[PDB]
Symmetry: C5
Subunit: 307 residues, 5 copies
């Protein structure tokens, strides 16, 4: 039962793909285990680079495949290194870049909380043969958060476990349990850009929408309100070409609907003001004086929806 | 006639390409068959990973090529494992990610119902040489319907068959028969997002389309409807740049056609109302008060395209 | 002069790239020719898949390179199979996916008819050496044209010809003639979507444009047509996001020009009626009574461009 | 000093990447030189394709690396062929699809004409070791420019020179001059589509912009001009989605600005016209019929950027 | 401690990826060092290109792997050359295309200054085995900034330093030592297109925004003002569709915000003016005379917001 030490160096976590629920992660893996001693020039340890490694395995070297469970496709592997010690122990080293998968709820975008996840598990050897002794995760990052899209807030998670499969092969006595390394990183979205350039002008759209009411005439009140729709729709497209594609509504997505409603409500009100009467033009001078009523009556719908 | 057991592990199904009638699938194939009994180190089964598999094949290990029939181009194959047993049987283990094809009808979008399909068939060995014994597909799926894009309803459907090829080699008697595994997953689209954010606002527009009829003046009636047609056009672009690429109209696309018609029909009435006569300035007192005549007339006809 | 029979299996034709004049084709090549008698294992044929084919060539099996003339870059080659017969003949089988080139006129879009073409020609052996005996191409044809972007209508033509190069290397006597396979597939674009979501609404825009003439005031007539000019710009971009990139005008693109033109023509008429004059007020009430005139002529000028 | 004859067969030039300044080229390289007399099967020439070439080199065949100086990344290598003659001479043949770099001016878009360039230069051998004897470039060209994106009008140019590198290896004797083949192909952009679907309508817009002055009222005159501001802005977005992203203004980019200016200048006139006064109402009695001044006044200025 | 020469020939820097903090670099690397004296063919140096290098390493040749630390994924490598001189020295030569990462602030867009960084560091050899002796960087770049995306200003800075990694595999004395080459290249963005086609028209809108107060009536003063909101929105989409996507505000977007803001305050005034009163209609004849009041108050903030 080989105790295998692992260490993951996270260099960059970037390129989150919103629809696929996918992100890319650059780094190095370091795997070590103690086999039993080998002969070698002097009393040195050896360095074995890239192409010369399989030359070593062809002569019967056991170098186990350690698989990234949650990666999408095969990872781009840079330089690889075998360090063979005289006492027996063996360092495997490789740089990697791969696209990883994980469940990502974006409903409350751009205020979403997500976590970048790594899961490592040997491909061919169960826990009785190859199991992970201990694991360090080195995230060489700090400061300059206000420039990055994602703010790592935690440091790094680490969890060695045993996973068993009950539906198998049909070798069963104990080829059921593989030891699995899982790395988690909590990160928060930098909401700044969407706040000041998307949320903020939207509010100004909706507010100024309501000021259709301090128009004097009815025709003005109604006609103008159409120009306002033309406006929200226009604001929809500007939002939509640009915001990341999803299969469910975000916060902003709703705000737009809220825009549409605010108004459709205003259209009905404007017609009602005019046509609830005892003559014809009995404008409910207080319902037309929903001048400061309904802008706040819109806040009732907004903060109830916070609950 | 070699009996080969197969097992498919579906890991992620994502990236539906609507035009290419294409979807991406991450998973594993497992193939096992009984060979001639061998001598392994000790007496334990012997494990052979990646690079040395080719070495084993080159010295004569029969590993049949199993081709995915409906894959587009050759797929990203991860790790390969040969597990060689002393009793004879051989266990093939390999991870894959591929683009797969199937006829996919999207006309009833976003209410479309689909089935994701896999087809596996040996490349060079017919049914009299290589035969598919049995097939289980392990689809590690459940829950979160609500939140992500596709709702699986099936579990894993299956049909092992013999395929007859009419036009061949220079082979004669019965070697036109290949055994093929076909794996099916029935699935439904989560229409929530398109319902609330696309269908709903369109309705408010078409609702507002009709609100031109509560305008008082004639000049007011026609100028207004032009801004209103401009508005539906504005909505089309917002819609189209976002919606999936297709070669036919969706349900949504029709709603848009219905929008234009609504307005264009409204234009005809308004002009018709004004210049048909019996003095000169004959406002048809009833026809203009069709204010909620055909808006329900859209609700009647809309609920007519039903079937 | 080795006689080589070939067969092409057309699996999918997709992804027409209009500017590159490029489309994708998935399939198989089957090359068969008769070699010198070999003594095989047992007496039935020996099959060589993928990896092992390369080692057979190194020890001197002649497997001629067959290149796709009209492919863009090298094709994604799938499984490879060498089937070696005892009477001598050898059958090569390989799966491929590649992007192909051909002259593709898209002017009559969305009614363009194309032909997807495969041209096969030996790389190193001219017809004195390697000759194409015959070729059938099996298209996986039938039904569901209405769900597909392209409607294949011919069942492909085929003609083996000999192609001669006047301009060569330092080879002399008659090594300037190569035998070439040409596969043509007649295909038409599915016009449904482009008709109903693009042509139809556009027609109504141009029509409703003309109803500017039923306005009573001059001021209205002119400030109005600016909204309409605003609409054709609007309709263009909506078409523009979507329609395939070209270096020439399409049919739709023409319709848009006439739209711009129709209103700019209206602007001139509207002003002409109004300010050339005997008066100030002398809109020739019959020249402005081109409300139903100018629509007849748009079909006259419209149906000539069919010329 | 090995004399090497080279010939390039140009198959297709496509995919101009405007921001990267790169275009892709399909074709073949043909290089020939004389080696030392060899023994061939019989006495006929020997053909060596792809896989077997690698092995000829291990046993000591001198195959010089000819590098594309101006390629971006390494090119897609198709089939390779060695034709080995008994007297010694050698013919190298390869298909390529490559990403090429060259300086490209787009300021005068869409009327730009460019020259596509290839530069070939040995990777390891100076001119005294390897010298380029001559180069023919065969561009299989003719006809239907009207369907293609680019109109090649030249017939391919040729330039062999010696290139000197001042700074070093540090093998010094003369190290420093490599023989370089430079190939140029002159081409013009097909302006047809950009003329009729962009230039023409922009003009009608700017033209109709001037139609604001034949309005009788001031409010009509000023309010309307806002719509034209919206129209030019609308036309801006419509243009920008389609046009090539660049780091400088094109002819069209300016033509748009000319629109903005024509309208913005009109605004100042219209404002100036009404309120700088001797009464309240002092529209300068002849300045409001600046309806025919400013349009030709835009044309004099338009004909000014001659320069 | 092996003394190693390095030389970097940069022929292209392109493809700045704004969200990923990424840019591409094409060039060649040259590394040389002195080994133990060798027996070469004849006595002049032997050149080893591509394929034959693997053969040389198998005979026990030490060729060190030099890694680009700040690359994302592995570089696209072209031709490789070994220059083996008889006295011991060895010179490595290779083409590369790589995607590199560096901290990149884009807030001051389009007036940003950046620096492109290359970091070279041995993969397996610490400072007392392999040391970087010296480094020249050849920037074969010059002139014609007129036309390219970036303006190089420096001549690249260079700094070899010793990078020590804090913790280990357990050896303490001095094996935590790596020599690192850092190459810096200063560059500035060409603001020309973004100034003239984005900043300038934006300003005229904002200018013309203020143009609502020379309107006579209140209803028109207010009705028009909604059109300006729509126009600023319209300009947002046009800008955002084309501008590079980022996670923070640029200069231009701020201008857009100020655009929305300038309009919203004017909206407040137009209402403020009319209905604080002693009748209903006594328009503060002084506050719609704020016609050049706060355009300068906006320009004062424009002058001040630069500090
Ligand atoms: C038993 C396992 C199950 C798994 C899903 C993952 C693995 N690491 C262990 C490899 C396989 Br082939 C076999 C498939
Ligand atoms: C006979 C077959 C036909 C096929 C289309 C599919 C296959 N599995 C069996 C392989 C090929 Br090469 C030969 C092509
Ligand atoms: C003589 C030929 C000409 C060709 C265009 C096509 C081919 N099959 C025969 C190969 C090449 Br290298 C030589 C180029
Ligand atoms: C609503 C919009 C607004 C815009 C400025 C940009 C667009 N993408 C959406 C197209 C137009 Br025509 C309509 C003009
Ligand atoms: C001496 C040269 C200089 C060059 C820029 C181009 C080349 N063909 C000759 C290869 C290199 Br590595 C060496 C770099
Ligand atoms: C010890 C090192 C540390 C490093 C960050 C960089 C390197 N060149 C030396 C490779 C690794 Br894997 C190990 C990671």
């Amino acid at each position: 039962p080989v105790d295998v030490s692992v260490s993951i160096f996270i260099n960059k976590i970037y390129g989150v793909n919103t629809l696929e629920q996918t992100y890319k992660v650059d780094g190095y893996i370091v795997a070590q285990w103690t086999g039993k001693p080998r002969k070698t020039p002097g009393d040195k340890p050896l360095i074995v680079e890239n192409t010369q490694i399989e030359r070593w395995i062809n002569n019967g070297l056991w170098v186990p495949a350690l698989e990234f469970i949650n990666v999408v496709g095969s990872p781009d592997t840079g330089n690889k290194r075998l360090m063979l010690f005289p006492d027996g122990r063996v360092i495997y080293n490789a740089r990697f870049l791969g696209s990883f998968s994980n469940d990502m709820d974006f409903r409350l975008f751009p205020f979403d909380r997500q976590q970048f996840v790594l899961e490592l598990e040997p491909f061919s050897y169960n826990n009785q043969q190859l199991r992970f002794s201990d694991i360090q995760v080195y995230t060489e990052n700090a400061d300059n958060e206000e420039i990055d899209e994602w703010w790592i807030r935690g440091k790094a998670s680490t969890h060695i476990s045993d996973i068993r499969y009950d539906h198998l092969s049909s070798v069963q006595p104990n080829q059921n349990e593989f030891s699995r390394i899982t790395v988690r990183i909590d990160a928060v979205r930098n909401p700044s850009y969407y706040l000041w350039s998307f949320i903020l002008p939207l509010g100004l759209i909706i507010a100024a929408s309501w000021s259709v009411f301090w128009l004097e005439s009815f025709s003005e009140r109604l006609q103008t309100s159409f120009t306002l729709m033309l406006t929200v729709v226009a604001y929809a497209s500007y939002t939509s070409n640009i915001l990341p594609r999803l299969p469910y509504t975000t916060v902003i997505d709703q705000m737009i609907i809220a825009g549409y409603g605010s108004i459709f409500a205003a259209i009905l009100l404007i017609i009602f003001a005019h046509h609830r009467q005892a003559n014809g033009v009995e404008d409910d001078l207080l319902i037309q004086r929903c001048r400061l009523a309904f802008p706040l009556g819109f806040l009732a719908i907004g903060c109830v929806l916070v609950i």
